Design a protein around this ligand. Structure first.
Ligand SMILES: Cc1cc(/C=C/C#N)cc(C)c1Oc1nc(NC2CCN(Cc3ccc(S(C)(=O)=O)cc3)CC2)nc2ncccc12
Ligand SMILES: [Mg+2]
Lengths: 414, 556
């Protein structure tokens, strides 16, 4: 790694000037020790006041780990950085990664610190270790190598990455290998006993061809990812309220499915009746319920992924640690639906549960489509902005907006 | 000649595509010219400026100002044009420390660092752009042309580059003297410590010795500040701190400028004076722009101002931070969306106080506001102290548990415990999850003509009860809320209500206890009186019994 690839920003765009948010003393102390070591290793250098850019930074702890890790919010720099075209202009996402029965996620971000960064672009990676109570100026650094979390780091190390994996690819041709940012997604159809041992064969490859967090390995099983089709109740006695909610759910599904009819079920509601009164099903109503039930078995038609459009993810809080979600690009055309429950570590903390939910949905979006979705979060902005960094454990950060009006379709994804 | 190490220069560039300034020198009188010549001759001896030839094409105008305190002229080089063309810098003084976050430092010494204030070298490639011309006597001679060699007082990058350079100079001393506190303020260095008075001046002489490595003679500032320090609007005593005296004027003609300075003083005083409110006072400047317009004082504003004068009658003081003790924050509700809080470590002795006003919305509840206040205090505490405080909140543990487990949004407040300080935050109504057996079932609906603004609203029930009310100057959304209000008004203690209004559902499912809409407030008052209320939603115009009957009754 001698020469540096010339990179720049988008035409008519300046560097990132993002405010560093406050940090607790424990996280500041951790960032100081981490950056002191990175400075000795030449990875970062101090900068002067002639550098007006800034990118936020904070400290996290990955899943099942004790030592801190520096995480840099390169979201603004990434969207202002030029689009990268190598000798190949682009790789289509491997559709087989989501089809394998086991996918292990390996952090390979440590391999980036061996490739220098273009000296003209280093000023744009400026970040500040904040001080407490403005008592001292912030310790200002910039990067000298490829930084973790920058979109250009895998788009530059990709030439070197193809050669490190070339020996392992030839030995196992039925293994799908995909890279997103600092992570490496390795999928196969072999058993976990043969998978875990084979995964460690790649760990020593980075040790020989070139890490602290290389030991950890997050295991996924995309073959056992659940889908949430629309289901209708099966009862023997229906109250007025049961039928009202049923017709409501069917009317909502009629936007997604063609041919949903509620006429015969609406006939059962004969004027003003008590909500708790049992209404017997007629033959015309039972056949209408049966026809709608067969319609809901088939998937939605005209549902396609568009690489040019954004992926949108909405989340609903269902109570008792249960969260539902849908991924789409056009309304009422879900590409993926799911439900989460029994969130680890948070049974009295709503925000930690939502934070883990966002990370899991993002991971699924990377495995399936190779990019992250824009989240619509059921939480007030001030509460989420105060606490999400306390529970974050991924090396990437998606975008998000805030929903301030209660959705009515919540009771229908339940 | 004792060798002194040089101060590293900061590389400076103009903005991309722009050139240096080329402003014409204004005509100056014969006495101003002679003054500037003598001034610039002194500065040239000190190496601060240097004469230049005619090839330099840049120029900024220079002026001569005279003061009344001392009968002397002063040089002023207008760098407004150069600053517009100078790059942006990383300003390292955006914020100031809050006194409540400072630890007690027994001994403090003030040092004069003005010897370095006008001695930081400027980037050699940038001095071209700082050129200025002294006009000559009677314009019969080419004017004297100078350019700066050091940071010019007034240039865009002078504050940032100076503070950066001083910080780099001081860095090794502070690192090897952790028991020493240093704060930069213009041309004065404040060096404090918790050491005995003997060992303190020992390290001060060591700081003088370290600063001499760069040729910076730093004597003790003459006429050292008598306590308290008057700094950035505070009074810094060795053991206490407060804001500078806040006095409220007693006027009869109150203009909007008087209130802008009144709320400003009240906001500034609210960081130590507990219980300050500024709602009804700042409520009077909703859309005013004319700073000279007079506005009458409402009876709520006069009553609010009277409460503040009593609070500001006696001065109160705050204490300094002790890292060895816990950080505790306590909140109280004040009404009309106003909250006040105190942060302390020992009881009755506050580090600081504060307040929180509710965000401008249409519907709200106390639990949401208290939660917003908690996040504000949490963020402020991490700024000031670097940690989250323990919260004392006027809300029952059971009330909070019931709220967050049933609220549709994710929500969370950090470690907190209940403090029985009325008025307590309460849940004023809770809707049912399933329909109520034995309770009358009201099917409600409303409708209005968009052109004539005439509408109808009412209900039909399973017991035959009916009502339809004619309405004037109304909307579709308004008649939908009115229909629900009528159902609550004419029902017993328990009631099932069936509506098709997605709009009304969204309002009620937000669980407000107060609203800007008078109709919504009437609904809330009705909800509080009930024992059980189940609210059901159905799609409209779908042949649903009861819903379709009342739909035909309200559509005229
Ligand atoms: C040193 C300093 C001065 C000023 C303003 C001066 C003016 N104008 C402002 C700040 C922020 C500042 O910086 C820091 N200050 C402190 N502590 C404070 C707490 C007590 N105050 C009041 C006081 C005590 C004694 C006397 S005396 C004459 O000797 O009786 C007089 C006044 C001074 C030191 N700790 C710090 N820690 C870490 C980093 C910086 C610290
Ligand atoms: Mg209607």
């Amino acid at each position: 790694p001698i020469e540096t690839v010339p990179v720049k920003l988008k035409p008519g765009m300046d560097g990132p000037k993002v405010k560093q948010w406050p940090l607790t003393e424990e996280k500041i102390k951790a960032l100081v020790e981490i950056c002191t070591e990175m400075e000795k290793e030449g990875k970062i250098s101090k900068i002067g006041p002639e550098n007006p850019y800034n990118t936020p930074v904070f400290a996290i702890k990955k899943k099942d780990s004790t030592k801190w890790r520096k995480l840099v919010d390169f979201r603004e720099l990434n969207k202002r950085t030029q689009d990268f075209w190598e000798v190949q202009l682009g790789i289509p996402h491997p559709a087989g990664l989501k089809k394998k029965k086991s996918v292990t996620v390996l952090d390979v971000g440590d391999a980036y610190f061996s490739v220098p960064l273009d000296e003209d672009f280093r000023k744009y990676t400026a970040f500040t270790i904040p001080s407490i109570n403005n008592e001292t100026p912030g310790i200002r650094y910039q990067y000298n190598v490829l930084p973790q979390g920058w979109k250009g780091s895998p788009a530059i190390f990709q030439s070197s990455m193809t050669k490190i994996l070339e020996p392992f690819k030839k030995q196992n041709p039925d293994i799908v290998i995909y890279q997103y940012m600092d992570d490496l997604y390795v999928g196969s159809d072999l058993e976990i006993g043969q998978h875990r041992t084979k995964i460690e064969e790649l760990r020593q490859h980075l040790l020989r061809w070139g890490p602290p967090f290389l030991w950890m390995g997050y295991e996924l099983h995309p073959d056992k990812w659940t889908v949430q089709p629309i289901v209708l109740p099966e009862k023997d006695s229906w109250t007025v309220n049961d039928i009202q909610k049923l017709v409501g759910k069917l009317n909502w599904a009629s936007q997604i499915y063609p041919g949903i009819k509620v006429r015969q079920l609406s006939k059962l509601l004969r004027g003003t009746k008590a909500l708790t009164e049992v209404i017997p099903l007629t033959e015309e109503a039972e056949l209408e319920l049966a026809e709608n039930r067969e319609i809901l078995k088939e998937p939605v038609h005209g549902v396609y992924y568009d690489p040019s459009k954004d992926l949108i993810a909405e989340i609903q809080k269902q109570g008792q640690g249960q969260w539902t979600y849908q991924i789409y690009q056009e309304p009422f055309k879900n590409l993926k639906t799911g439900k989460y429950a029994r969130m680890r570590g948070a049974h009295t903390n709503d925000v930690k549960q939502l934070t883990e939910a966002v990370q899991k949905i993002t991971t699924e979006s990377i495995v399936i489509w190779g990019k992250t979705p824009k989240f619509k979060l059921p939480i007030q902005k001030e509460t989420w902005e105060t606490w999400w960094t306390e529970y974050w454990q991924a090396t990437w950060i998606p975008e998000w907006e805030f929903v301030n009006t209660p959705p009515l379709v919540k009771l229908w994804y339940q | 000649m004792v060798p002194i190490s040089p101060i590293e220069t900061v590389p400076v560039k103009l903005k991309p595509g722009m050139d240096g300034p080329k402003v014409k020198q204004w005509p100056l009188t014969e006495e101003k010219i002679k003054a500037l010549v003598e001034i610039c001759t002194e500065m040239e001896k000190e190496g601060k400026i240097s004469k230049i030839g005619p090839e330099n094409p840049y120029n900024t105008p220079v002026f001569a100002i005279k003061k009344k305190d001392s009968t002397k002229w002063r040089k002023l080089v207008d760098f407004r044009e150069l600053n517009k063309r100078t790059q942006d810098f990383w300003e390292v003084q955006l914020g100031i420390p809050h006194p409540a976050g400072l630890p007690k430092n027994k001994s403090v010494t003030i040092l004069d660092v003005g010897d370095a204030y006008f001695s930081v070298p400027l980037d050699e490639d940038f001095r071209k752009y700082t050129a200025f011309t002294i006009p000559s006597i009677n314009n019969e001679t080419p004017g004297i042309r100078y350019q700066y060699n050091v940071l010019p007082q007034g240039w865009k990058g002078s504050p940032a580059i100076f503070q950066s350079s001083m910080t780099k100079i001081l860095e090794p001393f502070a690192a090897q003297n952790p028991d020493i506190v240093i704060y930069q303020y213009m041309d004065d260095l404040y060096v404090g410590s918790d050491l005995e008075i003997g060992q303190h001046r020992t390290k001060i002489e060591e700081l003088r010795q370290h600063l001499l490595r760069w040729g910076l003679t730093t004597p003790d500032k003459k006429h050292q500040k008598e306590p308290p320090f008057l700094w950035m609007g505070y009074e810094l005593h060795p053991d206490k701190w407060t804001v500078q005296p806040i006095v409220l004027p007693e006027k009869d003609s109150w203009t909007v400028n008087d209130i802008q300075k009144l709320v400003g003083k009240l906001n500034w005083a609210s960081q130590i004076y507990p219980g300050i409110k500024v709602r009804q006072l700042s409520k009077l400047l909703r859309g005013t722009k004319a700073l000279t317009e007079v506005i009458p004082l409402t009876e709520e504003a006069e009553l609010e101002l009277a409460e503040n004068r009593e609070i500001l009658k006696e001065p109160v003081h705050g204490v300094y931070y002790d890292p060895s003790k816990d950080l505790i924050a306590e909140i109280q509700k004040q009404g009309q969306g106003q909250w006040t809080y105190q942060i302390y470590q020992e009881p009755f002795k506050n580090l600081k106080t504060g307040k929180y006003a509710r965000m401008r919305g249409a519907h709200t509840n106390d639990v949401k506001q208290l939660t917003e206040a908690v996040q504000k205090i949490t963020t402020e505490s991490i700024v000031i102290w670097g940690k989250t405080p323990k919260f004392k909140l006027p809300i029952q543990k059971e009330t909070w548990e019931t709220w967050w487990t049933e609220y549709w949004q994710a929500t969370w407040i950090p470690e907190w415990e209940f403090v029985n300080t009325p008025p307590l935050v309460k849940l004023w109504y809770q809707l049912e999850k399933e329909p109520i057996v034995g309770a009358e079932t009201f099917y409600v609906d409303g409708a209005a003509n968009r052109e004539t603004k005439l509408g109808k609203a009412g209900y039909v029930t399973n017991k035959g009860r009916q009502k339809v009310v004619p309405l004037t100057n109304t909307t579709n959304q308004k008649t939908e809320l009115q229909a629900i209000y009528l159902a609550l008004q004419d029902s017993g203690l328990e009631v099932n209500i069936v509506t098709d209004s997605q709009y009304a559902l969204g309002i009620i499912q937000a669980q407000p206890d107060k609203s800007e809409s008078e109709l919504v407030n009437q609904i809330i008052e009705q909800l509080i009186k009930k024992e059980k209320v189940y609210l059901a939603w159905v799609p409209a115009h779908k042949g649903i019994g009861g819903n379709e009957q009342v739909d035909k009754l309200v559509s005229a």
